[PDB]
Design a protein around this ligand. Sequence first.
Ligand SMILES: Cc1cc2nc3c(=O)[nH]c(=O)nc-3n(C[C@H](O)[C@H](O)[C@H](O)COP(=O)(O)OP(=O)(O)OC[C@H]3O[C@@H](n4cnc5c(N)ncnc54)[C@H](O)[C@@H]3O)c2cc1C
Length: 407
Amino acid sequence: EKVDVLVIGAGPAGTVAASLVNKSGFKVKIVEKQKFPRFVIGESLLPRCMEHLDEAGFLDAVKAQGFQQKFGAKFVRGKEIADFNFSDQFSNGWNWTWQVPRGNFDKTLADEAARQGVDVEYEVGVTDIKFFGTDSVTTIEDINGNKREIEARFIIDASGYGRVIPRMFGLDKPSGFESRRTLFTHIKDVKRPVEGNRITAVVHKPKVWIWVIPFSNGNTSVGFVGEPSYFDEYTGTPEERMRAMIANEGHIAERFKSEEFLFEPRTIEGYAISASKLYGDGFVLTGNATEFLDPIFSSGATFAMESGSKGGKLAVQFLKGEEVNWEKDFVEHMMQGIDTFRSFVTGWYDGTLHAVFFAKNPDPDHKRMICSVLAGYVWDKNNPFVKKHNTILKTLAKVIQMGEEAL
Ligand SMILES: Cc1cc2nc3c(=O)[nH]c(=O)nc-3n(C[C@H](O)[C@H](O)[C@H](O)COP(=O)(O)OP(=O)(O)OC[C@H]3O[C@@H](n4cnc5c(N)ncnc54)[C@H](O)[C@@H]3O)c2cc1C
């Protein structure tokens, strides 16, 4: 009923945010609305998150789980292949990370946090927040419908898709990206190749792509993402449709034909969304309670940990009575990273990026710089592709074509 920081959500955002707060002696609580383990989408991590996993002391717990290691991202268009190796990049920093079922991953983290001294309470869903200056009174509901209040010096809203605070005080801002649909499931990957240390993204149609994410449990997450009109071209049950879409892609058709699905395929549409501000008196937003761009380059959970870390470190500065420039130490920081992936998303969809990816004799320096963007090092200002992100793709692609005509 009385705490320094109330963390809403036991996802990677709130677990990382919580650990860092606890690490500095304060009293911090996570209320998690679901029972863990609990399914959520967003399974392919980036090397950059290893930084926060390391700082929060989660690395050992995660390693013990034996998740599938990830050494890069592979892009397929027909038979054209562009393999990015995280071991060859412009930036210093981590060169490898994990593909993880989020149920098990997010429980590993939460459970480590609790152990660390964080008190984690499950099956208790926020329902109302009332602010008095920077102090707050939060009401939770347990599984039995009974309500109780929590008093805090600060709320870190790590509610992800719940968008707890953004919805309570109307902080939702349309994204700018146009609506897209997704269909996905896990597949028992009996016919998996003997490679494996990659996420693979498949250029299926002009504006449709697919993700193939290998886990260490025998299964493989597969998801179609793209233009909604495309999905309407298939008729039938989620499973029928899903098996139909796979059958229409040469790169995976035979591999997944007839293989078992761990669960009926799920849809997510209009997943792009932003916030009018990322913080206010008594709170900061994190992860998906901030802004989600697009799944292409698998960054969501890394942004959630990055923002959870930053908001965590900053909320400690607040509690200590230090001056905090949220605009500069938080917002500007999240947007630098978020604006970088934005440019690469746009370029994924507008044709420019593909031209770079599938250029014959791609420059190996450009490749490296691009590779550090894919690894999450989108704060490295020395990396021209970070420096010039809203320009370089369109610019590079023109230069490529100029090269094509010459010959
Ligand atoms: C199709 C698709 C594919 C994606 N692929 C990837 C990917 O390969 N890699 C990647 O990094 N990201 C991916 N993402 C993004 C990703 O899913 C998120 O970035 C990630 O889950 C966000 O972490 P989070 O901690 O911010 O929120 P969440 O992971 O959603 O967790 C928030 C927690 O808050 C809890 N909660 C919600 N409401 C309340 C409440 N009222 N009270 C208490 N608790 C509450 C929830 O139960 C939840 O546990 C993908 C997204 C989509 C749509």
